[PDB]
Amino acid sequence: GPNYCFAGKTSSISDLKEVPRKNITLIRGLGHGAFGEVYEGQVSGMSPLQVAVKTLPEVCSEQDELDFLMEALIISKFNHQNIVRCIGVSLQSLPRFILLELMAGGDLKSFLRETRPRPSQPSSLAMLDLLHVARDIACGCQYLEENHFIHRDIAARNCLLTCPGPGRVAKIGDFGMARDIYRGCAMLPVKWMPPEAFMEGIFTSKTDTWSFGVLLWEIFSLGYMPYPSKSNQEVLEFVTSGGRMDPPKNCPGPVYRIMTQCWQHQPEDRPNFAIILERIEYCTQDPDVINTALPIEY
Numbered sequence: 001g002p003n004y005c006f007a008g009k010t011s012s013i014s015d016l017k018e019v020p021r022k023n024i025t026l027i028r029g030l031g032h033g034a035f036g037e038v039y040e041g042q043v044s045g046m047s048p049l050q051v052a053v054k055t056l057p058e059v060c061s062e063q064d065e066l067d068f069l070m071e072a073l074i075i076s077k078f079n080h081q082n083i084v085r086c087i088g089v090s091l092q093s094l095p096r097f098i099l100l101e102l103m104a105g106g107d108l109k110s111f112l113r114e115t116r117p118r119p120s121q122p123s124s125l126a127m128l129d130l131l132h133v134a135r136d137i138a139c140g141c142q143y144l145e146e147n148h149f150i151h152r153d154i155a156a157r158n159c160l161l162t163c164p165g166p167g168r169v170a171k172i173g174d175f176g177m178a179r180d181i182y183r184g185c186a187m188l189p190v191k192w193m194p195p196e197a198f199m200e201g202i203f204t205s206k207t208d209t210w211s212f213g214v215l216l217w218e219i220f221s222l223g224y225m226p227y228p229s230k231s232n233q234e235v236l237e238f239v240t241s242g243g244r245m246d247p248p249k250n251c252p253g254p255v256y257r258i259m260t261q262c263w264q265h266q267p268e269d270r271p272n273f274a275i276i277l278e279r280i281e282y283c284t285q286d287p288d289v290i291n292t293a294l295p296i297e298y
């Protein structure tokens with residue numbers, strides 16, 4: 001049985017909150033992908049608690065088994081409002097379950113794509129909504145940084161929202177990349193990686209800073225793919241040459257500046273998450289920033 005260490009503390013399968021299987025009802029499928037397989041569920045104490053349920057295939061390898069356990073351990077040890085909570089697990093029944101905080105808004109990438117301003121709904125999103133999401137994720141990233149946990153895959157695809165409408169809170173919802181390393185390839189998130197990451201292969205919280213800058217571009221572009229028209233190798237060469245993305249359409253200069261400082265070639269020239277947060281908050285208070293209209297997609 002493997003042990004997991006976070007914030008100087010060691011835990012194992014024993015420390016996970018096993019919820020009796022009979023207390024868990026699957027309500028509906030939500031979807032599947034690189035994150036695994038997710039359902040809406042209910043937990044009763046006998047008003048039940050609405051949750052998300054990630055499942056482990058019954059037909060699976062033993063590394064698969066150990067992956068699932070590790071994912072459970074990693075999430076259960078995080079304690080932050082901008083990281084999805086783990087309600088508990090159900091590993092003593094088959095198929096195995098991890099019970100997570102339900103995020104009714106789905107993944108951030110799809111939300112931004114779906115909620116683009118249009119002639120029919122020309123004010124579905126405003127700059128302040130984008131800045132609030134950015135702040136939400138920076139806050140989760142600051143927690144990770146101060147706890148010396150390197151995420152390694154900060155991207156819109158790995159972020160979730162509490163709800164579609166006003167008052168949505170964005171949260172880090174996937175830790176698969178971090179789980180894999182705790183245990184180059186075509187699946188590597190190259191377009192989110194700093195130049196030194198392909199090179200001497202050393203990751204720091206400043207490598208997360210780089211990725212956060214790319215996330216920021218994703219947010220302000222309303223969900224576009226980074227480096228449009230470039231392949232992984234092309235991006236890699238472009239980025240290490242000093243090349244950087246243009247601002248997303250209608251991006252205020254102050255917001256773009258946060259991106260460009262996140263993409264400084266030298267790691268020590270890049271802001272930590274406390275500085276990123278300060279800059280986002282300043283942007284949030286500047287009327288010329290927040291009064292800037294997002295583009296209408298025709």
Ligand SMILES: CN1CCN(c2ccc(C(=O)Nc3n[nH]c4ccc(Cc5cc(F)cc(F)c5)cc34)c(NC3CCOCC3)c2)CC1
Pocket residue numbers: 030031032033035038039052084100101102103104105106107110157158159160172173174
């Ligand atoms: C109109 N939209 C239709 C889709 N709808 C939703 C709502 C919720 C989810 C979803 O799985 N939510 C999760 N809640 N908690 C999770 C924990 C964990 C996870 C896993 C996870 C984490 C992450 F960071 C990103 C993900 F995509 C999935 C999810 C939840 C959801 N999931 C989809 C995500 C895209 O792939 C298909 C399913 C969709 C939003 C409304």
